């Protein structure tokens, strides 16, 4: 159950996810997973980033779920579960702003 994962924040808004992540103590890749505000059946992975251009900022990626039972951000790289998707992105940045590092405090 995705609801038992400490990185799953359930039904919080995008603005609230930004408030939690825009903390100067958060290193790049600090993240959380929440329900999408407008897309029924999709989740959003919210991730903190940092560069000298923008400083501290937050990106949101849509995690799609297939009825066949697969989870993915890009259809070319799918996973059997949200847990496996999170594990994969903690090691590969691929197209994300940064690899996932720490669960949002
Ligand atoms: O849940 P939100 O606020 O991040 O709003 C969205 C609704 C649906 C999809 C997405 C949202 N924000 C941009 C990225 C994808």
From Swiss-Prot:
Sites bearing Phosphotyrosine, chain numbering: 43
Tissue-specificity statement: Expressed ubiquitously. Expressed in the skin (at protein level). Platelets, neurons and osteoclasts express 5-fold to 200-fold higher levels than most other tissues.
Compartments reported by the entry: Cell membrane; Mitochondrion inner membrane; Nucleus; Cytoplasm, Cytoskeleton
PTM remark: The phosphorylated form is termed pp60c-src.
Coiled-coil residue spans: none
Residue ranges constituting the SH2 domain according to the UniProt record: 7-104
Transmembrane intervals: none
Domain notes per entry: The SH2 and SH3 domains are important for the intramolecular and intermolecular interactions that regulate catalytic activity, localization, and substrate recruitment.
Subunit structure: Part of a complex comprised of PTPRA, BCAR1, BCAR3 (via SH2 domain) and SRC; the formation of the complex is dependent on integrin mediated-tyrosine phosphorylation of PTPRA. Interacts with DDEF1/ASAP1; via the SH3 domain. Interacts with CCPG1. Identified in a complex containing FGFR4, NCAM1, CDH2, PLCG1, FRS2, SRC, SHC1, GAP43 and CTTN. Interacts with ERBB2, STAT1 and PNN. Interacts with DDR1, DDR2 and DAB2. Interacts with CDCP1, TGFB1I1 and TOM1L2. Interacts with the cytoplasmic domain of MUC1, phosphorylates it and increases binding of MUC1 with beta-catenin. (Microbial infection) Interacts with HEV ORF3 protein; via the SH3 domain.
Function (record text): Non-receptor protein tyrosine kinase which is activated following engagement of many different classes of cellular receptors including immune response receptors, integrins and other adhesion receptors, receptor protein tyrosine kinases, G protein-coupled receptors as well as cytokine receptors. Participates in signaling pathways that control a diverse spectrum of biological activities including gene transcription, immune response, cell adhesion, cell cycle progression, apoptosis, migration, and transformation.
Additional information: May be involved in blister formation in Pemphigus vulgaris, phosphorylated-SRC is abundant at blister sites but not in normally adherent tissue, which corresponds with loss and disruption of CDH1 in cells adjacent to blisters. Phosphorylated SRC is increasingly abundant at pre-lesional sites of blister formation and occurs prior to changes in abundance of CDH1 and DSG3.
Disease: SRC kinase activity has been shown to be increased in several tumor tissues and tumor cell lines such as colon carcinoma cells. Thrombocytopenia 6: A form of thrombocytopenia, a hematologic disorder defined by a decrease in the number of platelets in circulating blood, resulting in the potential for increased bleeding and decreased ability for clotting. THC6 is an autosomal dominant form. Affected individuals may also have bone abnormalities and an increased risk for myelofibrosis.
Family the UniProt entry places it in: Belongs to the protein kinase superfamily. Tyr protein kinase family. SRC subfamily.
Name the record gives this protein: Proto-oncogene tyrosine-protein kinase Src
Organism: Homo sapiens
């Amino acid at each position: 159950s995705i609801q038992a994962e400490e990185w799953y924040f359930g039904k919080i808004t995008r603005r609230e996810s930004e408030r939690l992540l825009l903390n100067a103590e958060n290193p790049r890749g600090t993240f959380l997973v929440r329900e999408s505000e407008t897309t029924k059946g999709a989740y959003c992975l919210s991730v903190s980033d940092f560069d000298n251009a923008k400083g501290l900022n937050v990106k949101h990626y849509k995690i799609r779920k297939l009825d066949s039972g697969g989870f993915y951000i890009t259809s070319r790289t799918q996973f059997n579960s949200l847990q496996q998707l999170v594990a994969y992105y903690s090691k590969h940045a691929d197209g994300l702003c940064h690899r996932l590092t720490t669960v949002c405090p």
